[PDB]
Design a protein around this ligand. Structure first.
Ligand SMILES: Cc1nnc(Nc2cccc(F)c2)s1
Ligand SMILES: Cc1nnc(Nc2cccc(F)c2)s1
Lengths: 164, 164
């Protein structure tokens, strides 16, 4: 009942896949659940993979930082893919304490209660093309702590204003 | 030769110290080296702890995202604590590929090649007062990978424009 961690980098260092490819593979291989916490979500390829998972019957829960939520909504609209009407996906927002918006500065992807990607990669074109980042691929016991954190966040999340 | 990971949260969840307190304790207990990678560094209390470590003889290496470096410089000036003249501290900047600045979106604190804090907490007042975040405290074998990443980043870092 241990934990295993591999590191991945952007740009890649001593591994065959990029972080984006690894994200898409994790989502592609999802069998049951995807739980995503993300600060900014505008990457169309990743969104497509998630939409496709939900059509296979995977339950998708997404928590987005409230202050950047409009960027995700804009992307979903551009793609003609209204997220409210997709039945296997629920999207809710999370914020911090305001003073200037307090933000949810956490991100991670958890698939099938089995594997977590945790790190500094945000789901935006800029992270594929411009920024340096790193993530961990986590399996084993520590995944349970990410499950618990997701549940904690989900409990403090709100329905986005737009959804009625 | 395993790895141990504890999670900490802001706000705290089932641990006695905040992330900021844990940062200050790690720096206070540093005996040999501090290697810091940080996107934005404006927290004066953390800066003071680092300056104090360097006066005990701890070697301090700091890598900052180039595009936000001026915020650190402003803070060091406000504190009357010119970083160029402090002999045990070297500060260098890192950037990504531009298109809008490409950024170093990585952060971590490594102390004494023994302990790493890795997560989403940036050294700014907003992370103490406004934002939700989480970090890992990592000890054991995985610390060596953070040592290697620090060295990799340091190799691609530049002297800040201001320093002459
Ligand atoms: C990892 C996972 N975290 N919980 C899972 N599912 C779930 C069910 C109800 C509410 C909620 F927020 C999440 S699977
Ligand atoms: C963890 C640590 N990472 N390397 C350490 N020291 C060091 C020495 C020369 C250049 C440099 F970038 C770093 S200690």
């Amino acid at each position: 009942g241990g934990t295993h961690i591999d590191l991945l980098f952007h740009p890649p260092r001593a591994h065959l896949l990029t972080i984006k490819e690894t994200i898409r593979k994790m989502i592609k291989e999802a069998r049951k659940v995807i739980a995503l916490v993300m600060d900014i979500f505008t990457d169309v390829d990743i969104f497509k993979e998630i939409v496709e998972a939900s059509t296979r019957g995977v339950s998708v829960y997404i928590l987005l930082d409230e202050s950047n939520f409009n960027h995700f909504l804009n992307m979903t609209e551009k793609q003609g893919c209204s997220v409210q009407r997709l039945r296997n996906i629920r999207v809710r927002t999370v914020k911090g304490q305001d003073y200037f918006h307090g933000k949810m500065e956490q991100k991670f992807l958890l698939v099938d209660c089995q594997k977590v990607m945790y790190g500094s990669y945000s789901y935006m074109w800029s992270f594929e093309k411009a920024h340096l980042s790193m993530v961990q691929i986590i399996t084993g016991q520590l995944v349970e702590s990410f499950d618990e954190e997701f549940r904690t966040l989900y409990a403090r999340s709100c329905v986005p204003s737009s959804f009625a």
